[model samples]
Target chain A: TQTITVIRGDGIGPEIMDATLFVLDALQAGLTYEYADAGLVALEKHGDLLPESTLASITKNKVALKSPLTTPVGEGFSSINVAMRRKFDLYANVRPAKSFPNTKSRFADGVDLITVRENTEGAYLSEGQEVSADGEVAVSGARVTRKGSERIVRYAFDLARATGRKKVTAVHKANIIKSTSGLFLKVARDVATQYPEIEFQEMIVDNTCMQLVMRPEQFDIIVTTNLFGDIISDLCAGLVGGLGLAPGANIGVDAAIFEAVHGSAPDIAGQGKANPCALLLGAAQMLDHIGQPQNAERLREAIVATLEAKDSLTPDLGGTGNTMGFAKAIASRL
Target chain B: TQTITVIRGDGIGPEIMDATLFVLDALQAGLTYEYADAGLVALEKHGDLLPESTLASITKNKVALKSPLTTPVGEGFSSINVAMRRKFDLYANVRPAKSFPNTKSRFADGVDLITVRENTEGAYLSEGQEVSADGEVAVSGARVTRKGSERIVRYAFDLARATGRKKVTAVHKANIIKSTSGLFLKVARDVATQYPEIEFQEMIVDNTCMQLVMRPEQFDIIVTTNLFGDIISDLCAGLVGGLGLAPGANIGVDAAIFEAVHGSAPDIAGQGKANPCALLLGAAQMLDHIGQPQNAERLREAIVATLEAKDSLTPDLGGTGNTMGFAKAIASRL
Candidate 1:
């Protein structure tokens, strides 16, 4: 049996996590969830927002499935995820978008893509930034390393190969930002030679946005630095639907985290009103990461098939079914 | 008569330039064109891509209309426009998009918005950039000055007020890119208080993309730093059926330039198959810049009417009409 650290976060986190676990149980994959303390729960129980034990559990298990964590006041870190990313040196942030029926999506179908973001550096780090004494000038920069770019580019190609994807697109602003993004473009090209079976494409970030809008079907897997990935992933979410269906992953050599990137709905907490698809999709990502992609594909099919049938949907999905009922609907399809 | 410097660029540039001038002549405004040389034409005539005489003409007139320049090998500047933006301190890059009929746009209507990009500074600057000796680390930074941010914000509000736009949204990534984009957001907020009549909204860059894709009607004007603007502007172009209908303006304290933001295709250089709408739209922008708002409206309305009638449509727009004929169709509507 494979074990994964699970953090059922604050507000509506518990309901969605329970639903995901229920679906995982239906899949009958031998996955054992090790309950971890983090977010509000950790703050209350151990008086530490992210207790040392939770980090140890995640590090020991080497995988995590998490829901949204509420930001506690004057928190130890900006976000629970951010803290874990820095601590565990998670360097890849993966966001995937695909069209599902009965949603207000622009694309009826053929919008399946993943954005792999280099998580640690490149214009996102808080290092080497300052403002003038007169407040007239502010300086901020991105730091890119050969090691960082090479690993991320390789990670993208390896993911594509593992998942049976045909192509990988490396997006950058190399023509403009010569030193930082240019290096990314440079490394992306170098890594492409190693994976000759997979097609590689290069694009500028601005034009990439336009292309994504006009014909997102042209893209397969997009790999870019932190900031562009942040923008493009959300844009991809818009093409499919919105945050209600978006899932995210933070991967490193040591550990990987799969999560529903949206906030925990405090207003609907304990009201049986949470949409479980995002977390369920996150579980699918977890399944793929753990080398059980057959189960992953099956879970994804069940979600989409339930939506296509328009049966027993949740309130957020415009159906009267509650959280567990929606889970049951997806399970029935499985 | 008021004069504006004009550069008929290479390839289809001349075709579209002549077409634009033909339509401008029909406007019957007290206007004169001081023909200037840039791009390949300038390189041959003056042995320079951006000659001193051409710059003088633009400076003397304080206004210019331009098209794309084919990059000559080992040129003085990477892009002719980049040289002009730097030399003249052109700080505001304004791009507008509005839905028209019979185009491949997602939104049939109500997709009207302008993105006033701070052109001079931010992550796009080449001031601080370098890679280490071992090629392991690369550093690239954006420089944002209070003067830069303040003036650009003021320019956006002034343009909004002048054009009867009711709202301005400042897009940023201050939450993460603290010192650079953060200062811009800080300046944007301060500038917002100065123009109380214009409702000001602040949004993160990532969320802005999602918002733009889902409900572009909610936006009136967007002002942001250079890199995000480069992205948001093109994204806006996609909402209005893409670059065939996209036009741009570069505004500075002393001068302004209006033009189509596309390439000059050598394949259709003299064949007359090029679309004239982009340059025509640029001329419409030029009209607005010169305080000829009525003629600007007239020009834009004529363009939409021609598209609505599908008369003399260019090959690019799925019609057989050539460049000059497209201009004639718009002139007839006028």
Candidate 2:
């Protein structure tokens, strides 16, 4: 049996996960579940936000279905999500943002894009950070390793070729940042040589962002360094709607984590008003990761069909139904 | 008399600048003009892409009204614009983007925003940039000084107060890149305290991009470091349409350069099809810079009124008229 470790994170995380799990079970896609504590719950129980035992559970299981985690400031905790990636060496972050028909979005249709973000290096790495002696000047350097660039570009190209995508755009500010981003460009170009069938191009990050806003359909997949990826991915998410419909995957050599790309809305934890679409869609990605592509495709189709119907969605999706009601409705379709 | 140095630039640059000069003259604003050769014209005349003489002229004058300049990759000397800014230490890159009525933009109305960017420091500085000894790894360390941060933040606040802006949002990735971005945030916060009348806030760079996409009207003036500003300012320009209507200013302690934010499209350099709105609007900004705020405001109103009339406009603005046609239309109204 394949196991999918679950981390029902903070606030609305549990509510969304609880509903998402019910829908997954209804699919009966043949998977065993392992619960892993994290976020505020872990902070309360283990006196640590992301405990070693929790990460151990995910690493041991090889796959994790996670809800949104809150990284509260001034609480003596770094971001649990970022911390976990650093520990596990989650180098590639993939976010597939596609629009469904009849859904309420700024670009209602023709907004299909995948952002392959290098997660481990660049601005997110531990190295290249320094504080001044006077405590007045701070400096943070971004490191771009060849390994980081090669793998992320290869992953993007491979995904594009495998999924029938037309192009892979490597976004960087190499014109200005010259060396660091220049290295990333060189590695990406080297990787591109291996797969000439997929159209390989490079765009300055600024033009890429503007082009995304003007004509999103022009892009199939965008691969970039950590900070650029972080901003671009979120911008693409806004193209379809917002975090309520966006999902992300943090992938490593040995493990992967599926997550809803939003915050833990503590205020809406028990209001039954939260949207489960992102969480359920994240679970769908998990299914694909664990060798259930057909089931994953089917789940996505069902979700799209329901959203097009516009009858049982949460407020974010333009419906009056609460979180539980929406989950029940999706489960019925499953 | 205040002197305004002019670079007619390439292709559309000369055409649009010609139109802009016409408008400035008609306004009868008492400003002296000095023409400096640049772009292909400069390359031919001086055998230097951006001649030292031209730099001397800009520095001596302290302010310039420039059209877009184009540089072909692998075919030119270093970017003339970058060289000029580096030589003059022009540190703050300010871009103000707004939607005009009757324009065929993605955003119909109520999209007015300013991006105040640090221009000198961050990744743009030509230091610590090199290919590793192995010829594989590349390194470029970004440096940010406290004095640099203080100057730009103070410029933004001063500009916002002068323009009667309501809020100033400082964007940075302080959570991860603690030193450079952190120092920027501290300086911004300190400057914000001095301007208590303007509502001050902060946003992580990634979230700022996403928020701008989701709701374009929610922002007023956004301040950021050089690299982030380069990416985000262009994105902001896209919100109201594109660089076609985007006007920008580069400010230093002793000098400021005003111009169209878009590049010189050599392909469309002399073609009447080029849009003149950005360059003309940039001239309007120059007017404001030299204590002609009344004339600047009046010219801005006329341009908006001309667009609202929609009788004649450049192709990009969804009218069939050429560059001169659009310029004449606005001037006729004024």
Candidate 3:
């Protein structure tokens, strides 16, 4: 048995997390859970949005499964997600957008791709804002390190090789932003040589966006910078369905955190109408991280089987059933 | 007759430009063309990609109709498009993505939207790169100006009012990159107060990319800063068809330049297999700019009717016709 840290976040987070845990239990996953709190509830309970205890638990477990959390807007309260990524130095953000059965999406099949995003660097950094003396130009800085590029590209290639994927496309805007994106492309080319087995290709970020929308089946695995990754991964998710079925994994050398990439639907909190597929898929990723690939495959197949049955799908998936009912259906399939 | 500077660009550019001119002349549009040269031909003849005489002519005419130009890769030769935009202060980049009959695209109809992008500022500015003392981080800066934000937002709203579009959506990443995109969003909100007739909405850049892929019909007009606009405009083009059917306009206080947004395919340079629809549609935009809306409407209708007929389409549009044949078909419809 392996112990994993679980953060049951705010709003409908608890409901979906409960459902996910119930499904995992039915699968006989042999996992011990260390419960923790973060986000809005953590702020109310411990006067901190990201409690130190939760961080310590995740650090010790070296793995975590998280549900959707409410990030308080405005100053004084920072984003718990960004904070956790920084604290753990989660350098690679892996998001898989795949076509699921009975999902409301444009592409019913042949839509499977993973976006490996550089999590720590690029335009997301907030340390570079400065206003001109006359208040005319407000400048924001984006940092790209050679080490960061090398590692991220290497991570994507390694991932492609490990998963038996054939191709890895590195997306960037090197044509326009010459220095930052140029350096990324330079480093990616250097790393591409190391992995001779997998096919490597480069694409301009804007063209990549257009190509993805026009023909998604052509791409296998896409690796890009933070900003482009954020945009392209969501576009990929939209092709399969939406954030309702999107699951993300933040992987690092020391630890890995799996979470639902969707937001907490506070309006539907106590209604029992929340969809647990995102969190359940996050749990499946956690199962893979914990050396339980067979269990992960089984859980994934069970979810697909349950979706194909379509008798107990939640409201989000165009059904009248509740979160527990859908989870129970998946469990029955298992 | 109004004189418009024309740049017959590289490779297949001249052929498509000739076809577009043939269609325009057949329609009896009251316009005179002042012919000039740019791109590879200009570079070979004058030792400069964009000659001073070409700039002088555009400055005098205040309007230009251009075909696609090939920008030589690597150092020494810079992008003529970027240089021209900077020289003329072309701040508003307008791109319209509308569905046409018999086009190879997913959306057959009801896809019409304009992307009004800020052309002068944001991440595309080259003044932002800095290397760390230890060579660990390469930082690139993005600049956002109050004047830039105010003017671009005002341009979008004014265009919406002029074109009878009912909505203007401002896209940004204000939540993460708070200072630059935040300033843009703040200015957009301030400018939004002036045009209350048009519905205003805000969307994060990443989410906007997804929404565009899923439900493009919902967006009437999208206005955003540089990099986001570059990505979204091309993504919108992919929604209806591709760059083959995309026409763009660069508007400023002094001059406006209309052009086809695709590249000059050198492989099929003199083969007459190139599609001239992009350049012809660009000429239609030029007509609209020259206060010939009736002629513009006629040209647009003729092109659409010709496309629907599908009797004389170029190879790209899946027909057995050459460039002149397609242009003749469109002219016949007119």
Candidate 4:
């Protein structure tokens, strides 16, 4: 049995975690889990935004399934997501956005794309960040190291080849920010050379975003920098059905963390109305990460099936049921 | 009569210029023109891409109605657009993307927005750029000076107030790049405080893009740096009816240039299939810039009314005619 770590973050995090855990238990996969805290709750109890105990648990387990944590803008600490990635060296962030049946979405029929973002580097790296003495000016330096570019590009191509994805588009503003983005394209192109079966090309970030909205089906997987990735991943989410249905995976050399892309709905915490699909899908990703592809595929198929059977879905998914009811439906399908 | 210097640039440029001139003459807008060579034709004549003669002509006239110039990638001279902006100190790149009725577009009913970009500064400066020895590293410095931001923001607000726009959204990525973008925000906010009637707010660049795609009607006018403006203007173009319908203006302290946003189709230079709407609209903008608001409004209304009539339009507008035929129809109306 593999011990998969879980960070029941803040606000609606605990509620969604309960739902995901129930579904995982019902599947009877040969896996165990340990829970910890990382955001506001951790800050209040231990005075550490991302507690050492949490990091140790995650590192020891070698896998983590997370839910959205309350990270008020310019408050308390740096983003827990950024902190965890830095600590564990999670260099790649992968978010696969796919539209589900019976969901009210803008591009429900044609939206299916994966956004692979480089984490732990680029602008997110906590180095060379400075503010002018006058305090009126601040600068955040970006380090698009060769090593960072190579691994992320390779991972994107690898994922594409593995999943039978026919295309991989590297999105960057190389024309403007030539050096940093040029290096990213260079590495991505080099990696693409090895995967001759998949069609490859680079698109400017702005055009890529516009294309995502205009014709999402044209793209299969998009690999990009930290800042652009954050924006485009959310854009893809908006197309499919907003952040409520978007699931993300933070992957490293050894460990990976899967979580919902949206923030913790603090207002709806413990109310059971929070949508659990993103977290449950994240659990599916966690299963796949640990060589449980069978279980992962099964969970994914079940979630899609559950969504197809509109009678058993949360309000967010256009049903009268709450979070428990949605979990129960997916678990029952499993 | 104001002597407006003209560059009947590449592809469909001359065709559209002819149409615009026809309308201007018909209206008797008290504007005379002096035609000059620029873009590819000018590049062929003189070794200098933007010759001293052309700059002198524009400086003398102080106003121009420009056609789209083709800027091929990796070329020696870079973009003619970039060169002109730098030499002329064209600090504000204003792009007005307003949807017209009876046009075949994604946004058929309502989509009107103006994008005011800081033209002369930011990453497009082409200064302090260097490539590393191994060719593995490339750096393009982005400098956002206080003077630059203040001017652009002031221009944006002034334009908004002048045009009776209710809101002006300042788009930037200030959260991370605190110094560069922060200064821009602080400067813009300080300027924005003076215009209380105009609803002012700031949005991260990516979010702004998403919002533009989702709810374009919600915005009135948008102001941003050169790089961001370049992308967002294209985005707005895509929303309205692609670049085929977008007209742009590059304004400096002493000079102004109006042009189509699309590339000059050298291959289709002599072809009759070229669309003239972008250039005609650009001419309309030029008319407005030259203090011939009546002729400008008349030409604009004529173009909109012509589109509404749906009988006289280029192939792109779902009509069965060539470029000259559409021009003839528009001229007939004027």
Candidate 5:
């Protein structure tokens, strides 16, 4: 079996993991699943939040499917974010929003797009933040590098081609916030020149939000600086039923991890209520990563078809069925 | 009659002015019109886009209802913007987006809100912007002072109370873009305390967009830093069929200018086909400035009623009617 590392995180993480893997197995996604522990489970089992075995499995696989990893309060650590992100050198924060049938969202259809954000640099840098001694004035600045811009935009392009996307819209506010935004745009254009097969366009960040609200279907891939991307990626999530139905991927040169952007619902741990859509959706993203686009599309379409039936949807989606029923329902549809 | 300066500039500006005035008169707007010339018309008649006579007229009247002024390419001077705006020192940019009945937009109804943006400072400084010697890196910084933050939030609350708005949402990115946005958030909270009659809430800039898309009607007024304001105000525009149907006002201590913030459609010049909703709304804003808030509501209601009936909407609004035709219908409602 070819290896795929999976980390089932805290709370309702285990139940949703069961549902997700059930559906994944039914879909016949041939991959070796090496189970790993992180979050609270890792702390209790391996005497650490992230043990060596988990890290080794993830690094060896080079691709991971994960649930939300919770960090306990005053747990003698920072969040699971910086340490893990730094270790993996994660640079691209990719969020894809796709409209589903029978979903309450802005658009009922035609709301599929990827927001690729530069994760390393651009806003709120520690080196350039200070306030006046009298507390009357405050200033914050950021650095934009040709290297960072090229890398992210290049990742976005490769992402577009791999996923059969057509356009890469590099969003910015170069007209006003010239120095940082301008450099990013300049490098974005240079990187775009190499990807002739993909159409490249530039839009002001404000205008991008307007267009997102009005004509979301017109966009496919959006790459931008960190701050704008943080704002925009969340906006994209809202367009299609918020993060509850969105799957995300954080990628870097050496590895990539797909996950549900929402948290592990501690309130519903081991309960049969947690909807497995985001986690299942995460598995679909993994399929796309492991050179299996056809299976990915099949899984995605079947989920839509299952949702349309409304016969076995979880309570979150306004149905009477439990998590396993929903999983089995999707599997039956497949 | 109390005096109000009217500057109707090039392209379809003259015709929309005619329609706007017709409705204003029909609503019994008690204003003596002091006609002024600027843009290309002033250029032709007085050899300047903004002549001394026009400036004198605006200064004398103290309040002005304006159409979008055009700047001829390759003109002798820079622009008609800095000179006029600097002269008045307009500090708050106010834009309102309201859903019209039977409109072909994202949200069919219940999308009324105002966005009050700080106009003077943040994000547009020619100072403190630089690139590396080889252009490998670029950095830019901005200064946000208590003076700027306090002035704008105070204006937002004043605007809110004057218009009978029930709530004000001050949007920021304090958790990350902390130095500047944090100061803004703190000042906004301070100003909010004085206006107990109205509700005050703070929302992060990113979540504001998500909330805006999902449930826009929950908001009444939004105030924020310049860059966030610039991004959000236009997003508000898109929610209500865009600037094609949005009115704008730039306000300061001494004077304020209200106008339709869309371009004069030179292609549709003098054809009686331009929509007059934005212009009518601008006139309503002018009414508010003159302490006639009740009359402003009446004017706004009339336009909404006319839209509801679909009696005489312009071509852009998916109707076959002309500009004056729509204006007369709105007047009929009054």
Candidate 6:
């Protein structure tokens, strides 16, 4: 059995996490969960949003399945999610936007693509700012490291090969912003040469966005810098469905965290109306990360089958069943 | 009669310009064209991509209707389009993505919205870069000025008021890139107070991309900084039909130039198969800018009616007719 850190976050996080755990337990996955608190609950009890104990647990387990955490607006701490990624050096954010049955979306079925985002640097590094002395100009810096670019591109190609994906497209704005994006494109070209089996392509970020909407099936795996990847990953999510069905993984050298890429719905906190599909999908990713490919496939197929069956889906999926009922349905399918 | 600078750009640009001019003349819009050149033809003839004579003509007229220009790969002078925008200080890039009948698109009819982009700064600035002495890190700077922010936001709001748009949504990533995007958001909030009659909202750039793909009808007027605007504008174009049906305008305090947003199709240049709707619609925008809204409305209606009839259209719009036939159809409708 392997130990996994589980952060039952704030608001509806607990409900979804519990439902997801129930499904995982029913599947007989040999995994031990070390439950921890982050977000508001942790702040109240331990005077820190991300307590030292939670970090220690995640560090020790080297893997985590996280429920959505609420980051207070304006004046509080930095985003707990961002903080965790930085603390763990989770440099690659992997998101798979795959179509599920019966989800309301604009694109036709069979849309599946992965977006690998460089998580640690680029625009999100937030390194430099100067307000022109006269308050007329505000400049923010975007840094791209050769090391960062090489690893992220390698991570994408490696993931593509492992997943049997045929192509990997590196998206950037090399034409306009020649220095940073130029470096990114150059590094992408260099790294792509090393992966001879994978078909590699480059696209402008703007055209990439348009192509994602126009012909999503033409894409396989997209790797981009922090800002563009952030935008493209979300766009890919919309191609299949919204964030309601999206799952994300932050991977680093030492630790990895899988998460439901949705917010904690504070309005429906204790109600049984919450949907657990996102969190359950995160568990499926966790299974895959921990070398339980069979369990992961089984979990993914069961979730899809459950969604297609639609007999015991939550309200979000236009069914009458509550969170527990939906989880039970997925667990029964497994 | 008002004199407008006209650049018959390159390849299919000349053909499309001829067709658009035919329709405009047929309407008796009382405008005189001061013809100039910019693009490959000008580069070959005048030894300058953007000739001084052409710049003088545009400077004299302060308004231009341009066809697509070919910016040769790698070896040419700087982009003629970029030069014009910079020379004229055209800080607002306005693109309207409106659905047209008989065009192939995923969106339904009546999908109409405008994307107002800040043209001067943000990621496109390409200001700072430092390849570390070890060649490991490359940092590119993104500069956002308060003056720039205030002007672009004001321009968007002013355009919304002028066009009778109901809402303006500011898109950014202030949540992470605090200083630059934060200043943008702060200025947007301040500008929003000046237009209380119009609804104002702010969205994260990534979420905005998803929302645009999911439900584009919910947007009326979207305003954002350079990079986000570029991506969102193209995504919006895909929502309507592709760049083939898209028209764009670069607006400044002293000048405005309207053009087709597609490339100069060299392969189909003299075959009479080039579609003129994009350029025709651009002429319509030019008419509006020149204080001939009646002619502009008439031109737009004629083009839309012609499309709905589908009797004469280019192959791109799924019809057998060539460029001249399509222009004549629109002229007959007018």
Candidate maximizing lDDT: 1
Evaluated on CA atoms against the true complex, candidate 2 attains a DockQ of 0.67
Clashing pairs in 4: A137-B179, A138-B179, A179-B138
Q: Give the Cα error of residue B25 in candidate 2, in Å.
A: 1.9
lDDT of 2 by residue, A183-294 (tens): 9998999999999789999999999998988888899999999888999998888888777678889988888999888888898788888988888888887776676766
Error of 4 at B23 (Å): 2.6
- Candidate 1's iRMSD: 0.8
Q: lDDT tens digits, residues B1-334, model 3?
A: 8899999999899999999999989989877899888988888899788999999999999999998888788767777878899899999999988889988877647888989999998989878776777766687889999999998999999887765689999999998898899989999999999998999999998889888878888999899999999999988888887888889999998899999988999999999999998889888878877777678779988988999889789888779999999999999988
Per-residue accuracy of model 5 over B202-261 as CA lDDT, tens digit each: 899888888888888899989988888898988888787777877888888877888998
Chain A TM-score relative to the true structure, per candidate: 0.98, 0.90, 0.93, 0.89, 0.95, 0.94
For model 5, residues A147-237, the per-residue Cα lDDT tens digits are 9999999999988888899999999989777898999999999999999999999999989999999889999999999889988988888
What TM-score fits each model? 0.97, 0.93, 0.94, 0.92, 0.95, 0.95
After superposing candidate 1, which stretches have Cα over 4 Å from the reference?
A: A74-77, B74-77
Model 6, residue A174: C-alpha shift (Å): 1.6
Rank candidates, lDDT, best first: 1, 3, 6, 5, 2, 4
What local lDDT score does residue A325 receive in model 2, on the 0 to 100 scale? Answer: 84
Write the number of the candidate with greater TM-score, choosing between 3 and 6.
6
What value does the lDDT take at residue A99 in candidate 1? 88
DockQ, all models: 0.84, 0.67, 0.72, 0.42, 0.74, 0.74
Candidate 3 error regions (>4 Å): A40-47, A71-75, B43-47, B70-75, B132-135
Whole-model lDDT values for every prediction: 0.90, 0.82, 0.88, 0.78, 0.86, 0.87
- Cα lDDT of model 1 overall? 0.90
Q: Which model is ahead, 3 or 4, in terms of lDDT?
A: 3
What is the clash count of model 5?
0
Q: What is the fnat value (0 to 1) for candidate 5?
A: 0.80
The interface RMSD values of the models, given in order, are 0.8, 1.5, 1.4, 3.0, 1.1, 1.4
Docking level of model 3: medium
For model 3, the DockQ equals: 0.72
